[PDB]
Amino acid sequence: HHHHPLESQYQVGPLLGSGGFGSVYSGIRVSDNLPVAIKHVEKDRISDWGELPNGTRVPMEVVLLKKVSSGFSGVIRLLDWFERPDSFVLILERPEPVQDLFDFITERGALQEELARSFFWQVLEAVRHCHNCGVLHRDIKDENILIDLNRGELKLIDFGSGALLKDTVYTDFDGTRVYSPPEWIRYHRYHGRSAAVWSLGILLYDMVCGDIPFEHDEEIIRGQVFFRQRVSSECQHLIRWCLALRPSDRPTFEEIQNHPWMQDVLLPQETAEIHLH
Numbered sequence: 001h002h003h004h005p006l007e008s009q010y011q012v013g014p015l016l017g018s019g020g021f022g023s024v025y026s027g028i029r030v031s032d033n034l035p036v037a038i039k040h041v042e043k044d045r046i047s048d049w050g051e052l053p054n055g056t057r058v059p060m061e062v063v064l065l066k067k068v069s070s071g072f073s074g075v076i077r078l079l080d081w082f083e084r085p086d087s088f089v090l091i092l093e094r095p096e097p098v099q100d101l102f103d104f105i106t107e108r109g110a111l112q113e114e115l116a117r118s119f120f121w122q123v124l125e126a127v128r129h130c131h132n133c134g135v136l137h138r139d140i141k142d143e144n145i146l147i148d149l150n151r152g153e154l155k156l157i158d159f160g161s162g163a164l165l166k167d168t169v170y171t172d173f174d175g176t177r178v179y180s181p182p183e184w185i186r187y188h189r190y191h192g193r194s195a196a197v198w199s200l201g202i203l204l205y206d207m208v209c210g211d212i213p214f215e216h217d218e219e220i221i222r223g224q225v226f227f228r229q230r231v232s233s234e235c236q237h238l239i240r241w242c243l244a245l246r247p248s249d250r251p252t253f254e255e256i257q258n259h260p261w262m263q264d265v266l267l268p269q270e271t272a273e274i275h276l277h
């Protein structure tokens, strides 16, 4: 299982990590001690720009976060942003305590199906929210999911590879290759929802098997799934449906949520009491 006036209103804490997303720090909003994450993105590493209603030039990541950050959801909310000479600074919600799903799987190995069902359900609700707001994440994977360990609530992070949702073909991609569908590998072409569903099949396999099913382009294109762990027939059926080679053979979000494997989900709080506390 491998990886693939600002200084006034916030007290900066430790660096949490850095990589293609930039540098993320632990912070606290001085006005009310709200835990926050403070994300720095270098201007010359932004390939994707957009504009807000009022029409200032910002990272697409900021456009997409604002579109999804209205109301409650399983998406980490953008509280504020700042422009500096050579960077943007994003202020994000930070649950406490928290663990990314990749780290959680490193520690626990393959998840019990009840727990994978609860997590997968919450991810589907979060992704529906994004699509309903006109946003395609395009990098759904365990590294981009945070677990609120007290509340059993999952949160989607890192909209740095995302785009506005459209009904026409995408011919650009900068998300994670091993979660990218066969139509991307073979043709550099995909549609948003069906590519999202493929990534969800990779994620669900990852949860119940403790690693992703495919490492190489050849395995993605062949689309034969081998189960390395004991997984129920119903769970294998859903995974193999999400991982249909032809995009139009993949389930819709409604078909995933109506699948027999997805019935009788735990509530997040019961999830945390049984599995996390």
Ligand SMILES: CC(=O)Nc1cccc(Oc2cc([C@@H]3CCCNC3)nc(-c3ccncc3)n2)c1
Pocket: 016, 017, 018, 021, 024, 036, 037, 039, 076, 092, 093, 094, 095, 098, 099, 100, 143, 157, 158
């Ligand atoms: C990219 C983005 O938007 N990040 C984000 C957004 C909001 C909150 C956030 O808070 C985090 C993130 C992580 C890492 C950060 C790097 C990616 N992987 C998860 N770890 C912990 C943590 C703190 C203290 N103890 C354990 C764990 N908190 C990170």
